């Protein structure tokens, strides 16, 4: 009834750090408890998350919660299904099949083409970034193909910020070449917020320009700095602000200090910290049933080495893998179910637009119902 | 006066291994002798490419050659510049910039777009297979945004052994739809051998049709196929057969025997293998250079471990991936030089054309100088 | 009873005299036995055949079975009618009547003369070989002069296989210089797949060419290359393999142990062996009905020798001929029945077409009724 | 010192024996007279050509002289190159090469495609009989299909003699609608006789029509019936009648009686019979040579039984076909010397087209040079 886990966590992570903690100490069973060995790190670092992954393994952890980028996902998936090591995650999911994965990002291919086809879009613009993986960009790319459609894919990921003045600039003259007026932002936070900075100064967010940022988090940047100008503009939002449980979780996570929970004072919490309260959860919830399944997984520090030469697995890990793929819950997410995969099911997306009163959501999106009009 | 390297091959890749030996006796001795260890393994497993990683280290190998997969490139560039260890290897280069690597494969985004520009085309396919990444395609697209053409990228990776007929000739249906005659193929040799016997049983390489062949090895498929059909057939080549050193080592190297040199009985080499053969001259060369200038290179000790705390590399790292960056050798692909980066630069591809006599070049194509026709 | 016959299988027939040995152990019974004497030999040579034709008559055997072309078939059919002893034979029918001889290979020319002007022909060309006949090409000048036909027969029997690759292209190139779209391929099974590889290797099997193959074997051969082109295909089967006896046989004949029985672990069966499980059924058959009809057939080892001078014959073959063509049977090739001369009459000729989803029987073809559409 | 020979000979060749013994009456030499035996049968029987051959095999004969047909050279060929017995014929050149065969009829499809080419043929009709085998046919086809010729090959062989009126004029009206006013007529003497008859009796030889027999014998028929048709008839011709040594052979000829010389009291002779005559000429020069190089070719004994398995071959029948081939001396159908195959080579054939007058040689035709006007 002592359960080491695992926690990678990127060096300048605070608010999905404090909403682990909040969900550890919210979830607390008197039963048991999670014991987290956090490692700060940076994950664009392939060779430093093979060592807090073996330091782990070495240590005797079950599961790893932990993050990871297009750089350093294929070394997390391979260590994973080799030595049988169930890894949760909040980051991308992996293209394919990976098994002891588990994926609780949905994915955002089926929306953002659901969204495209009921905004009546024939031709427009894909900025992205290759910081999180070209399965969007294919997807995008495949469905213009079958559809018919002018899709212009630019990428701006590979490009400094002391020259971004004179590159972005040419980048949106020749945008203006073709009178492009529809544009999809699939890049990271910094990058749309440099995205939309620079589009207020080009001037480019008058009316008559559409913009979609696509991410989950639609709420958590800058939506007052191109607010108003009257231009276009939809997102997607995974959490529901508006949800009895995500409003009383977020009045105590405004009550908290910001002292001992950085990042924890204000009234918006990031996908990815929403993500980490969810799979405390789901770990809890997993455990809890691996108990009343009356299941011995007892291990400790005896496992071995990371680089055993046969690298031998565990009997116990796929049965941890059964019993983390086999639940139910609700969160800041919403309904979370997961496939034999790794990734969540009947989850669903709750899709806004901006105005100049506010953000307001037009609608929601599911897997068995396509988008849908309030 | 031996110095022990590394060697990472797959499972499968004989003829790599027949020209590394080849190279090997016949760079054998000048002032000294190289001594290989070669650990054949799967090259798209992060976890089997670290264990051989951590294991020829712990060996103490000066340098490393092997293959890495778009899977598995990360885990090596890490390792290598966290330790100080040389990697050469003839796989497709990295994107970006990665010390202590040497990548012997030119380049062929540029090769490729002055192709276009000459063949002056407008709405040409793009048959791209996720294995060697997707930059070439993302500069087609930046391309194709900057001179206003029309792309149509279609993934042909992710396909099984069990409907790739069905799937081969829907989409070249779909491409009859849209009536789309000029098709470029970004695929290594089985793929493209795939779609030109896919394409050869639909009919669809008669006069009218055009198709260019994505890879540096041109000649390497079985072109003879398509030979007669009457469309165009244009490509890149690395090696020039006509050339006095191509010459004599495929006279020297068609006489040997496929017991113990598989691969190694047949008038044409891929250019994987030729850049083995030329990876092994400019091992040598670096170390001979090395030698001459007498510089101490011998460990003073054991190398260590792969996962030590903190990853101390030794200080002859930088000068054996000076030495061997610094190097200037003529070889079967042609002149050899590396820029700082460890990439390659003052090369030469030779675009050939596929006539009903056979293929004949038709021009090279240069860093400094675009394409030039003869 | 014991009843001996004679063979004479060509040296390289292993799918006929398999049929033959599966025709024998199924229709053998207790009421009688078949002992034969195969022998090898090339069938070309008019001096093998009649040294083995020899050989048979001096041991005493009743009836004759084997093969001939057309350099061996007159020197059998006048031995056979001077002897007055049977010969039954699937190979081509004489042109002529000829005593004695039993042909189970059904005519041809009427059943292409239909097809032809059921697709209302005027210009096409006909690609024969010497090797094969030239009654049908007899046939069919006839009947252009008839009828105003463009008529371009070629003969393609005289090209060695040693360069048999370039001829085929330059008599294409001359066939699309005098603008021939429609090609009638009479020819054996061998030279229609080396036809059919040179088409689909210039690219000439695509929409707007027609080919017919005028053989029997529609199916024989590997159609699968040309199937998806998209050229018409049209073609004759005298096997039809949805009938219920034709699906019994196939039954058991693809699981018949193919090194016991050489090729014969298929489910495609040529319509050479089809006939030759049908000629020993149809000698099966008159060999019983004689014995039902109280004749005295004992013959002893009188025969002395096949050049007796004079050559008297025995008088008990008139009634083994008798017997031979008074046989009403179904087969693998459907209904059998001999007329006086003993070429087969009340046959049926299923016409087919290649479709993309496999041939299709579209009609049949008689002597009594034209050429007839379902 | 005698050599024994064979001789074949059809049941009505009266004068070709005749001539075949006054050859060798007139070439008997004191150092050797030949012992023919002569066979009569019927030729188109295989059966008794074959008896025959082996009866003169058995009787130890070295080299056959004799007729063959259609039915029966297959058969002929294969017993002469099995036995390697030297046969020498005057009937049609074999369709191809055979070994141990010396055909002495000249070719006649160089000459008549010479004449059409010179004659500005491109349109006419082929009416044809499948007796000297389909070479002719072929060659004239192959001609028409490189020279762009509108040919109408009617075949008439099979047509019986009876039922050879409705359908004669329904032809020959079909040919005046057409304007198919030249023919060529490729048929024995017997039936171009019959088709010249008739001819004469619908009066279809007004002015325009233009007749080619495509025989040797020219004179050998009737053509004063058409003499004064005013209709071009033109033909071929192997035995020039203004020769010193032809003059001198038709009057000791016609000084014969046809007592004991049957058809022998005419002026006019059969090319068959001057070339059994050329024949027997060669048979003795090559016999003179053999036994003037001192060479016994004689055999102690009898040859044996030709369906001895396996065959009996011998050096001195090679050795014979050797003497054969290197014979050149003149005669009366010209020149005389075979090839390395056995063909007649360094022939000239003269060609007459039918005048008020009579005939009169037009021109000749040789290998070296093309057709010749005089
Ligand atoms: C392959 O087979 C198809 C059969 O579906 C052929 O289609 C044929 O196309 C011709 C076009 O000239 C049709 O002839 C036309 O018939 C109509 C109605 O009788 C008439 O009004 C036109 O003037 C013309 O004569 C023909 O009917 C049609 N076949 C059938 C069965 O309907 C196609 O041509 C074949 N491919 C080749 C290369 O021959
Ligand atoms: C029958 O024999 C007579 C006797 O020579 C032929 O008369 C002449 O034949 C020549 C060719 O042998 C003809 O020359 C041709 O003339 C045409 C123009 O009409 C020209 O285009 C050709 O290139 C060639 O030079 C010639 O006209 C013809 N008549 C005369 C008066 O000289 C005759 O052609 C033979 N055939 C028939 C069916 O009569
Ligand atoms: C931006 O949003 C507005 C309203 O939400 C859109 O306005 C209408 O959109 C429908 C949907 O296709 C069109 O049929 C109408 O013609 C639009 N009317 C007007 C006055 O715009 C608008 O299309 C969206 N996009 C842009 C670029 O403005
Ligand atoms: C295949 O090659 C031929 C000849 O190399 C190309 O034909 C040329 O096409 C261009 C179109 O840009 C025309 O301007 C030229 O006149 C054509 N002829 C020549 C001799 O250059 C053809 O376009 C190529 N591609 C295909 C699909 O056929
Ligand atoms: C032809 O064969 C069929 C099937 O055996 C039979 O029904 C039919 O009567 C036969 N025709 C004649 C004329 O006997």
Same mark, same amino acid.
């Given at each position: 009834?002592?359960?080491?886990? #695992?926690?990678?966590?990127?060096? #300048? ?9 909040? =969900? ?79 994926? %609780?990002?949905?994915?955002?291919? =089926? ?91 080009? #001037? ?16 958590? #940047? ?111 997410? =919403? ?35 396509? %988008?849908?009009?309030?």
């Amino acid at each position: 009834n002592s359960i080491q886990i #695992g926690g990678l966590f990127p060096r #300048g992570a605070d608010q999905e750090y404090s909403a682990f903690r909040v =969900g550890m100490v919210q979830f607390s069973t008197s039963e048991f408890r999670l014991t987290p060995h956090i490692d700060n790190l940076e994950v664009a670092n392939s060779f430093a998350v093979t060592n807090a992954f073996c330091s782990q393994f070495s240590r005797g952890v079950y599961a790893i919660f932990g993050f990871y980028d297009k750089k350093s996902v294929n070394t997390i998936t391979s260590f994973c299904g080799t030595l049988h090591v169930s890894f949760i995650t909040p980051s991308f999911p992996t293209d394919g099949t990976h098994p002891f994965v588990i994926q %609780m990002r949905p994915d955002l291919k =089926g929306a953002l083409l659901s969204l495209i086809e009921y905004y009546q879009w024939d031709k427009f613009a894909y900025l992205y970034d290759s910081d999180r993986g070209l399965s969007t960009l294919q997807a995008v790319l495949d469905s213009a193909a079958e559809k018919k459609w002018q899709v212009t894919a630019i990428n701006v990921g590979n490009i400094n910020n002391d020259k971004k003045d004179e590159t972005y600039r040419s980048l949106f003259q020749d945008l203006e070449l073709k009178k492009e007026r529809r544009v999809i932002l699939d890049c990271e936070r910094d990058k749309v917020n440099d995205i939309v900075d620079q589009v207020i100064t080009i #001037g480019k967010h008058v009316k008559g320009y559409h913009y979609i940022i696509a991410n989950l988090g639609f709420t958590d #940047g800058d939506l007052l700095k191109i607010q108003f100008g009257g231009a276009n503009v939809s997102g997607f939002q995974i959490v529901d602000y508006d949800d009895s449980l995500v409003s009383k979780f977020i009045e105590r996570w405004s009550t908290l200090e910001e002292k001992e929970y950085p990042g924890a004072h204000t009234a918006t919490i990031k996908y990815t910290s929403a993500l980490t309260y969810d799979a405390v959860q789901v770990m809890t919830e997993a455990f809890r049933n691996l108990r009343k399944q009356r299941i011995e997984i007892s291990r400790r520090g005896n496992a071995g080495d990371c680089l055993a030469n046969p690298a031998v697995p565990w009997g116990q890990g796929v049965e941890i893998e059964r019993a983390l793929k086999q639940v139910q819950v609700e969160g800041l997410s =919403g309904n979370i179910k997961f496939d034999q995969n790794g990734k969540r099911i009947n989850y669903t997306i709750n899709i806004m637009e901006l105005k100049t009163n506010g953000p307001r959501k037009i609608g929601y999106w599911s897997e068995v119902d396509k %988008m849908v009009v309030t």
